[PDB]
Ligand binder design. Structure first.
Ligand SMILES: Cc1ccc(C)c(Cn2c(CO)nc3ccccc32)c1
Lengths: 134, 140, 140
């Protein structure tokens, strides 16, 4: 069962960087984390999921979070799962993502935001990215 | 290859005043028995499933009262009834707002059950990028 | 060929107006593979990574003379038997309005941990329909 659950570095400047060797971070049976992307070890069905958390103090920003599939043969980047929030006293806006996908060996997976300056990396729990082979 | 019943379907962007689910699209699935019939997902065998859906609504400013809803429903063949499993009602409110509603949970389903994912306001749906509006299940 | 993963999805008792009573004994609610509902709390039967998730829904009529809506998920560990916040959210809803609050995340949990999911304003809770208010864990 290839699985992987990576979390964001709280020790990172203006960047969304996925760690595996953090507290509570599986990454088993061959799921590489290279170039900040999960590399799919074998072809099949996978549950792919994510969450990020934004915060700010008062307020025109749009916050986007997006998971993509970089195909191993084709080679371009396609949105798999994506959402947008409009945050307009401190505020907190998470974005949830997840679903099931047929993936190929070698495909890469991105989990990215557009405004890492509003990212809340204060602990863990709710800024994560992962895949689970079914 | 997994024998697990799964499905991931996506919204038709040029379905007018409708929330229409498609599988014949890149990165969309019906596998291991799941069917797409009359805009619904039919389950092929009993057991625990994860069920999930996202819609993303978008308006330009606010002149009101506007309400947005997103509802995943179950028709159990045995009971011949339609029941909500997951439902959110939200009040947004000339700048643009967005409201993404992600509904997920785990459920015990039966062979032949039918699953719907519906909203009140198809006109407020946004399709700027792909992957913004989807509906899926994953047998455990 | 069933899954042996600790899972649970519990729903608000729509009969208990003015309160938040989690029910696994209701249509489309469940406990499996050792998860218990005790004293309004979910009990974790084995250690591991778990997705915890919950939604509550608030509705009110007009906006009075000022209202803060909170939703909190807490953990009571065997090793440390007092409530620790895991997840938390607050909203000001200010003529009906609807304000759903969603919380979830992935956490390492121990055997016999007790999880709680609470609101401060049960009087604004809306469960005229199922699927609006729920709480659950799924073992990863
Ligand atoms: C309740 C739920 C049910 C089904 C699905 C697909 C998700 C998506 N999801 C999310 C969404 O932020 N985080 C996750 C962590 C682990 C597994 C799935 C996850 C959540």
């Amino acid at each position: 069962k290839p699985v992987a659950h990576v979390v964001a570095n709280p020790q990172a400047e203006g960047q969304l960087q996925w760690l595996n060797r953090r507290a509570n971070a599986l990454l088993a049976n061959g799921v590489e984390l290279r170039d900040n992307q999960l590399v799919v070890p074998s072809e099949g069905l996978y549950l792919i999921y994510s969450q990020v958390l934004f915060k700010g103090q008062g307020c025109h920003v749009l916050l986007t979070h997006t998971i993509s599939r970089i195909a191993v043969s084709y080679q371009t980047k396609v949105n798999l799962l994506s959402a947008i929030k409009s945050p307009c006293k401190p505020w907190y806006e998470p974005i949830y993502l997840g679903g099931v996908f047929q993936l190929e060996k070698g495909d890469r997976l991105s989990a990215e935001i557009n405004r890492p300056d509003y990212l809340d990396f204060a602990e863990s729990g709710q800024v994560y990215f992962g895949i689970i082979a079914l």
